[PDB]
Design a protein around this ligand. Structure first.
Ligand SMILES: COC(=O)[C@H](Cc1ccccc1)NC(=O)[C@H](CC(=O)O)NCCCc1ccc(OC)c(O)c1
Lengths: 501, 514
C-alpha cells in the first residue's frame, strides 16, 4: 500500500485524510491530495541521483484527522527501531526511527506534536498551519513552516480594504481557536489603520450531516437580521468550511444580497462550497490563499494502525476535475518541505555529487543544518527566516462560476518580504453597472462643513455647517470651526473669511 | 538537611506527583542547542508547601485503618519547572514499567502496565493541557489542583482529567448573575493578554449574550506601553461605569499603576480571583481613588494542622538520626526562614483533597471491607477511572463530588474592599451556589452620595425615535429625540431630515407640516 516506503533514511509524515479510528469521519479531498503530493516529491528525490547519490529516501505516513489520535504516531516515530524508547537526561546519541517529521496542518495538533518533539529536537516542518504563536522559537524550537503567517494574510486583507476604500466591516468568527485568534489579530490590525469593525459575532458550530436545532436556528436568524439592518456591506469570515453550508442557506432564505465576502485561508479554496449554485445571488466572493506554482509532471502521477483509507479514491474521482482546473496551491508547501529536508541532509552528510560519507544522523544536527539552507525550486527562492517562515507569495482570488473555466481567478498578488499588495487586476462586481461597491459609516462632508463624531468609532461622524463669523481651516483641523479675525466675517459654510464692518 | 530523599516512598500502590519545586531563572531562560533536559535551581516556597501537604495527606491515609486497610500507599514527586519541556520527562517516567527505564510503543495501551496508579497534576493550566493530552491517551487518571481553565472540561479531548478547583465558568456565571441582579447592562470586559484572560473573555462573551448584558468593549491588556493607553481611552470614551477585569496579577498591577498615573476616573471593577488576592496590587498608594472593587472568591476549609506538621518535619529533617531513613538540589538547603510565609495558602487543601480522592477511588475499586481487602489482581488505571467518574467522598468531614465534567461542586463568596484609611481589607457581602444571594444594604459605594452607580442601555426605543445601534455585538440602542424643525424620514433611518422653507413640525415628529 501507499503509506510505507523503505530507505536508508526515513521521513515521518502526518496528514489529515478525514474530517471531524479516523475512518469514522468524512474524507477530505485536499488531505488526500497532499498525501499523494508528498509521495510525488519523494519519488523525484529518489530519481535524481545528483541530489542524494547512493541513498534511498523513505517515508512513513499516518492519518491525523483531528486532535484525537496525535500521541500515537509521535510515539511510533520516536521509537528506537524496535518499539523501545529509553528515558534519558541527554538524547545527543539517540537514533530515532525518522530523522524529520512533515507535521500536521491544523494548529492544535501542530502544537501538540511540537510540544512532544521539542524534547528530542527532532526537526518538524508544518504546511499551511498559520497561528502566529508558532514564531516563538523558545516555546517551539524545533518547528519550521513552509507558509506565510496569519500576520501576512490579515495584512493582505487590510491592504485590499484600503485600496478600494472600505471603512466599515462586519467580522464573523467560528466558535473555536481559528475564529477567535484571527478575529483578535484583525481587531489589532484594523484599529491602527482607520478601518472600523461594525460588529463581531460568533457563528454557532453546525455540521451538514446533522439536523439544526431550533435554538441554533434562532441564533442564526438573529445574526442574519443584524446583517440585514446594518450599513456595513463588507463581511470577513473566519471559519472552517463545514459550518458555512447551513449558514449560507439561512442567508439565502432571508433574501440577503449585495455584500462583499472575504474568505480566510481555511475556506477560500473549498470546492464543495464553490459547488453550490445559489451563492451567485449573494454578491462577490473573494479569498486569500497561497499563490499557484505549477508542479511539473504532478497531475499524471495522482491519476500499524491509522495508515489506510477506503473512501479516498472514490470520493476524489469527481472533485479531481476541479483540482485539475485549480492551481495546486497548497501542494508546493509539501513539495518544498521535502526538498528542504533533502538539501539539509545532503549538506549534513557533507556529500559530493559522487558519494556520501554516511554517518548516524542524530536529528538535532539535521535541525541545525535545516536552519541554513537557501536554494531555488521552480524559479522560487526558499530559505527560512529566523522565525522559521518561508516567504511564499500570497494571492487574492475571486470565485468564478463559469463552469469548465478556472474556478478561482487571480485578482491580486501579495509579496510578504515587501509586505505589499500589487498587480491588482479587474474584479467583476455584483453592482448594477459594475462599479466598485461602497461602504462607509457616513458620507464625506461638504466644503466648509465640520465633522462631529457619533460614537467611539472614528469612522462615524455627522456633518455640521460652520456658522457666519467662523470658517473651517481644513489644513489644520476639521472637527471644529475657527473664528474669523477681529474685522472679518463669513458666509456660513465657506472655507475662508472676508472683510466686513 | 535531608529532605529531597523523602520525596519518594515505596508502597503497594504509588501516586505520581507534579509540583513546581523550583522556578526557572527568569534572567537566563537558556535556549537549547542539544537535546538535554533543562535544570532549575531557584527555589520557591509555595511549590514545596504543596509537596509537604501531599506528603501529609498520604501520611494520613497510611495512618488510618478505614481507607485501604493494610495497604501501603506511596508517592513519587517530580519537579515541573513551569516548562513543558521540563514537565514532559517525568510524565514519561511515570509510564515506564517497574524497574525499567523504557517506555515501549504500542497501538493500544489498555493492555499496558505503568508504574504509577494516578498522577497529581501540575498547578498551571498550560502544563495541565500539555500533560493531559498525553496522559489521556493512556487513560491515566490525572487529578489537578490549581488548573481552572474551562477547556479542560471537554471530554472529547480530556477523558481522564479531574480537578479539585472549580473551573472559570463557575466564577464567570457568578459574575454574570451579579451584573444581571444589580440591573447593569452596559459593561466593558478586559482580559489579560494570556490564554487565561483571553479564554475568560470568550466564556464571558458567550455567557453575557444570554442575559442581555451588552459588552461596550472587549479588550486585552498586555502582561509586562501605548496599548493600555488605547484600551483605557476606548473604555473611557464609552459611557461605562462597570468594568470586568479578568486578569493575571502583573497585568492588573500595570493597568492600575497607569490608571493612577493618568488620573483615571473611578469605576466599579469586577475582579478575577488571581487579582482579588491582591497583596502586591492593593499596596499601590493611589488605589483608594479607583472606585469600589468586588469579586468572587472560593470558600473552603483550611488544613488547620498543616503549619505544625511543617514545623515538625523541617525540625526532623535536620536531625542526623532521621537521615538514616535525590532529584532536587537546594531542596536540602531549606529552613523555616524560606518557607514560613505561605503556610495559610488554601491550595494546600485542594492538594490534600486531591490525594484523598484517589485513595477513595482505589478503596471503592478494591471494594475493601472495613476489616480488610479481598484478594485482588493489581488494579490498573483504567479500572480506577470508571469508579472515579461518579465519586462522592469526605475530606476533613466535608462532602465533595465529581460530576462527569470532572469539576467539583463548590460555592463562592462575594467579596468587597473596605478602606480602613490607607489599609484595604476584604469583607463579605454575599454567596453564590448556582443562585446569588447578597447583603445589598451593607455595600459602600465610591460615589459621593453612597448610592449604586448606573450602567445600562436602552434595548428598545419608543414612538419612532431616531435609533443608533451600539455595543461590540450590536445589541444596544441609543435613542435620539429629533428636535422640532426636522422629521424622522424612514423610521429606521440613521438621522432626521429638515422641513422646507415655510414648514415646521413638533418634537419626535414623523411628519412635516405647515
Ligand atoms: C482547527 O483547524 C481549523 O480550524 C482549520 C480547518 C481544519 C480542521 C481540522 C483539520 C484540518 C483543517 N485549520 C486551517 O485551515 C489551517 C490553519 C491552522 O489550523 O493552523 N490552514 C489549512 C488550509 C488548507 C487545508 C488543508 C487540509 C484540510 O483538511 C485536511 C483543510 O481543512 C484545509
Amino acid at each position: 500500500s501507499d503509506f510505507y516506503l523503505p530507505g536508508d533514511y526515513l521521513l515521518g509524515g502526518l496528514f489529515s485524510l478525514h474530517a471531524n479510528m479516523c475512518k469514522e469521519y468524512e474524507v477530505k479531498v485536499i488531505g488526500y491530495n497532499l498525501m499523494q503530493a508528498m509521495r510525488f516529491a519523494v519519488e523525484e528525490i529518489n530519481n535524481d541521483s545528483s541530489l542524494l547519490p547512493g541513498v534511498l529516501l523513505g517515508y512513513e505516513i499516518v492519518d491525523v484527522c483531528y486532535i484525537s489520535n496525535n500521541v500515537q504516531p509521535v510515539l511510533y516515530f520516536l521509537a528506537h527501531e524496535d518499539n523501545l524508547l529509553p528515558i534519558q537526561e541527554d538524547y545527543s546519541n539517540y537514533s530515532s526511527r525518522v530523522v524529520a517529521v512533515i507535521g500536521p496542518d491544523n494548529s492544535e495538533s501542530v502544537m501538540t506534536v511540537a510540544n512532544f518533539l521539542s524534547l528530542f529536537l527532532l526537526p518538524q516542518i508544518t504546511y499551511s498551519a498559520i497561528s502566529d504563536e508558532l514564531r516563538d522559537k523558545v516555546r517551539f524550537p524545533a518547528l519550521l513552516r513552509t507558509t506565510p503567517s496569519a500576520d501576512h494574510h490579515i495584512e493582505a486583507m487590510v491592504q485590499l480594504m484600503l485600496h478600494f476604500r472600505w471603512n466599515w466591516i462586519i467580522v464573523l468568527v467560528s466558535n473555536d481557536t481559528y475564529g477567535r485568534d484571527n478575529g483578535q489579530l484583525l481587531g489589532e490590525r484594523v484599529a491602527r489603520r482607520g478601518i472600523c469593525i461594525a460588529f463581531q459575532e460568533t457563528l454557532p458550530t453546525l455540521q451538514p450531516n446533522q439536523n439544526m436545532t431550533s435554538e441554533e436556528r434562532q441564533r442564526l436568524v438573529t445574526i442574519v437580521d443584524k446583517l440585514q439592518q446594518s450599513t456595513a456591506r463588507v463581511v470577513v469570515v473566519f471559519s472552517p468550511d463545514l459550518t458555512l453550508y447551513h449558514f449560507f442557506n439561512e442567508v439565502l432564505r432571508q433574501n440577503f444580497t449585495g455584500a462583499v465576502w472575504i474568505a480566510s485561508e481555511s475556506w477560500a479554496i473549498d470546492p464543495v462550497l464553490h459547488n453550490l449554485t445559489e451563492l451567485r445571488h449573494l454578491g462577490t466572493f473573494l479569498g486569500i490563499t497561497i499563490q499557484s506554482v505549477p508542479i511539473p509532471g504532478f497531475s499524471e502521477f495522482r491519476e500499524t494502525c491509522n495508515q489506510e483509507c477506503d473512501n479516498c479514491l472514490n470520493a476524489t474521482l469527481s472533485f479531481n476535475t476541479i483540482l485539475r482546473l485549480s492551481g495546486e496551491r497548497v501542494v508546493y508547501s509539501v513539495y518544498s518541505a521535502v526538498y528542504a529536508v533533502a538539501h539539509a541532509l545532503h549538506s549534513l552528510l557533507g556529500c559530493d555529487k559522487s558519494t556520501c560519507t554516511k554517518r548516524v544522523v542524530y536529528p538535532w544536527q539535521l535541525l541545525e543544518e535545516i536552519w541554513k539552507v537557501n536554494f531555488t525550486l521552480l524559479d522560487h527562492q526558499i530559505f527560512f527566516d529566523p522565525q522559521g517562515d518561508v516567504a511564499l507569495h500570497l494571492e487574492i482570488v475571486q470565485w468564478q462560476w463559469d463552469r469548465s473555466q478556472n474556478p478561482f481567478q487571480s485578482v491580486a498578488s501579495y509579496y510578504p518580504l515587501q509586505r505589499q499588495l500589487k498587480n491588482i487586476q479587474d474584479i467583476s462586481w455584483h453592482t448594477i453597472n459594475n462599479t466598485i461597491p461602497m461602504s462607509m459609516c457616513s458620507k464625506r462632508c461638504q466644503s466648509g462643513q465640520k465633522k462631529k463624531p457619533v460614537g467611539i468609532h472614528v469612522c462615524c461622524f455627522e456633518c455640521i455647517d460652520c456658522l457666519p463669523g467662523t470658517f473651517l481651516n481644513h489644513t489644520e483641523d476639521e472637527y471644529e470651526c475657527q473664528a474669523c479675525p477681529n474685522n472679518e466675517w463669513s458666509y456660513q459654510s465657506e472655507t475662508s473669511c472676508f472683510k466686513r464692518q | 538537611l535531608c529532605l529531597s530523599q523523602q520525596l519518594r516512598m515505596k508502597g503497594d500502590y504509588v501516586l505520581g506527583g507534579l509540583f513546581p519545586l523550583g522556578e526557572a531563572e527568569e534572567a537566563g531562560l537558556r535556549s537549547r542547542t542539544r537535546p538535554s533536559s533543562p535544570v532549575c535551581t531557584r527555589f520557591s516556597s509555595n511549590g514545596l508547601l504543596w509537596a509537604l501537604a501531599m506528603k501529609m495527606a498520604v501520611e494520613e491515609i497510611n495512618n488510618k485503618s478505614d481507607l485501604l486497610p493494610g495497604l501501603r500507599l506511596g508517592y513519587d514527586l517530580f519537579d515541573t519547572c513551569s516548562e513543558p519541556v521540563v514537565a514532559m520527562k517525568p510524565s514519561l517516567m511515570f509510564l515506564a514499567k517497574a524497574g525499567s527505564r523504557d517506555i515501549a510503543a504500542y497501538c493500544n495501551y489498555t493492555q499496558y502496565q505503568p508504574r504509577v496508579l494516578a498522577v497529581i497534576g501540575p498547578h498551571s493550566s498550560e502544563l495541565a493541557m500539555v500533560t493531559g493530552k498525553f496522559f489521556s491517551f493512556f487513560l491515566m487518571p490525572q487529578v489537578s489542583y490549581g488548573a481552572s481553565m474551562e477547556l479542560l472540561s471537554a471530554r472529547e479531548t480530556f477523558p481522564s482529567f479531574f480537578r479539585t478547583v472549580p473551573s472559570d465558568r463557575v466564577q464567570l456565571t457568578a459574575a454574570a448573575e451579579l451584573l444581571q441582579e444589580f440591573g447593569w447592562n452596559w459593561v466593558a470586559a478586559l482580559g489579560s493578554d494570556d490564554e487565561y484572560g483571553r479564554q475568560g473573555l470568550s466564556i464571558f462573551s458567550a455567557l453575557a449574550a444570554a442575559r442581555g448584558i451588552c459588552i461596550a468593549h472587549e479588550g486585552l491588556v498586555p502582561l509586562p506601553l501605548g496599548k493600555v493607553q488605547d484600551v483605557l481611552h476606548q473604555v473611557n470614551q464609552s459611557s461605562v461605569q462597570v468594568v470586568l477585569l479578568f486578569a493575571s496579577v502583573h497585568a492588573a498591577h500595570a493597568l492600575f499603576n497607569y490608571s493612577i498615573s493618568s488620573r483615571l476616573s473611578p469605576k466599579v471593577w469586577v475582579a478575577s480571583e488571581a487579582w482579588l488576592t491582591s497583596d502586591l496590587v492593593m499596596g499601590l498608594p493611589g488605589m483608594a481613588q479607583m472606585g469600589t472593587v468586588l469579586g468572587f472568591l472560593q470558600r473552603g476549609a483550611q488544613l488547620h494542622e498543616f503549619p505544625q506538621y511543617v514545623k515538625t518535619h523541617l525540625a526532623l529533617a535536620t536531625d542526623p538520626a532521621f537521615c538514616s531513613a535525590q532529584r532536587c538540589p537546594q531542596c536540602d538547603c531549606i529552613t523555616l526562614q524560606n518557607v514560613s510565609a505561605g503556610l495559610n495558602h488554601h491550595q494546600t487543601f485542594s492538594v490534600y483533597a486531591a490525594v484523598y480522592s484517589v485513595a477513595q477511588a482505589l478503596h471503592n475499586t478494591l471494594q475493601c471491607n472495613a476489616s480488610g481487602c479481598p484478594a485482588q489482581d493489581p488494579v490498573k488505571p483504567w479500572q480506577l477511572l470508571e469508579n472515579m467518574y461518579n465519586l462522592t467522598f469526605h475530606v476533613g468531614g466535608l462532602p465533595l463530588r465529581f460530576d462527569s465534567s470532572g469539576n467539583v461542586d463548590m460555592e463562592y463568596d462575594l467579596k468587597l474592599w473596605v478602606w480602613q484609611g490607607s489599609v484595604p481589607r476584604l469583607h463579605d457581602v454575599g454567596r453564590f451556589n448556582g443562585s446569588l444571594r447578597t447583603e445589598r444594604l451593607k455595600i459602600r459605594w465610591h460615589t459621593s452620595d453612597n448610592q449604586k452607580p448606573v450602567s445600562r442601555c436602552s434595548r428598545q426605543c419608543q414612538e419612532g425615535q431616531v435609533r443608533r445601534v451600539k455595543g461590540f455585538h450590536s445589541c444596544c440602542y441609543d435613542c435620539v429625540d429629533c428636535e422640532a424643525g426636522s422629521y424622522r424620514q424612514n423610521p429606521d433611518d440613521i438621522a432626521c431630515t429638515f422641513c422646507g422653507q415655510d414648514e415646521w413640525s413638533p418634537e419626535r415628529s414623523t411628519r412635516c407640516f405647515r
